[PDB]
């Protein structure tokens, strides 16, 4: 697993630049679970992978207790890669790429490149 | 040491019938 550990320039891991933030509505582009919408839950920047809600189904078996009781079967999502998703506005249902509009203020926001709205969420 | 091979150019023949043989019989 040393072939797959994180690369560490000056003891800190090399983190990737990506295009998906939390609270966004992604679509799976090609691999496997093709063509279904979803929020994302937890983010993994070093693998460039993202776990998204209620689509990826990995039925895993867990020895639950230390007394050997009830041994639950928990159905847990896995990591699909960040290049296999796009963003979605709920007004125009189409999977679109990203873009960085620099608006009238100092801040720079995301933008669906085919429609005309903004991915970026305010402070709430 | 010499590896050589030989494929002899042979011919298969099927036989039809034998004739022209009715001279000097020698039965015992």
């Amino acid at each position: 697993r040393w072939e797959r550990k994180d690369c560490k320039p000056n003891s800190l891991p090399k983190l990737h630049k990506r295009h998906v933030k939390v609270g966004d509505t992604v679509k799976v582009i090609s691999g496997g679970e093709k063509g279904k919408i979803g929020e994302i839950s937890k983010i993994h920047k070093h693998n460039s992978t993202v776990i998204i809600k209620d689509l990826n189904f990995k039925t895993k078996h867990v020895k639950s207790k230390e007394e050997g009781e009830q041994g639950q079967i928990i159905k847990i999502e896995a990591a699909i890669h960040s290049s296999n998703v796009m963003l979605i506005l709920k007004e125009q249902e189409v999977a679109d790429r990203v873009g960085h509009k620099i608006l009238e203020d100092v801040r720079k926001v995301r933008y669906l490149i085919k429609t005309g709205e903004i991915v970026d969420t305010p402070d709430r | 040491r010499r590896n050589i091979g030989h494929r002899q150019p042979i011919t298969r023949i099927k036989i039809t019938g034998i004739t022209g043989y009715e001279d000097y019989p020698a039965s015992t």
């Binding site: - | 040491r1 020698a26 039965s27 015992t28």
Partner: protein, 115 residues
């Protein structure tokens, strides 16, 4: 410019497949598989030339044993005396074959050699 290869194993696997039914380490063990390929092929040589020689010998003694069944002293040499004087060009010792496949016909051969 490393050059690790596989051609010794096909080179060697062909000779391995030829050396079947050699009773032991002459059929399994490569450093004897080679010399049994070699000695098997020269065995094929000398036993081929001496299968020509050996079947010549076998037909000579077979037609000799066929002619000597008359009882009266008629050898194999006298059968060739009166086999080339009476002009029969080169029956090629295949009368040692029809001497057992057709014994009445070789009795017609010999009984027309007498006359």
């Amino acid at each position: 410019r490393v050059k690790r290869g596989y051609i010794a194993r096909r080179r060697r696997k062909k000779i391995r497949f030829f050396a079947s039914s050699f009773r032991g380490a002459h059929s399994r063990l490569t450093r004897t598989i080679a010399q049994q390929k070699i000695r098997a092929l020269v065995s094929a040589h000398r036993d081929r030339d001496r299968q020509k020689r050996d079947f010549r010998r076998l037909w000579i003694t077979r037609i000799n044993a066929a002619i000597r069944e008359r009882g009266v002293y008629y050898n194999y040499s006298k059968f060739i005396h009166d086999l080339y004087k009476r002009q029969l060009l080169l029956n090629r010792k295949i009368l040692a074959q029809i001497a057992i496949l057709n014994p009445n016909c070789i009795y017609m051969i010999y009984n027309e050699i007498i006359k």
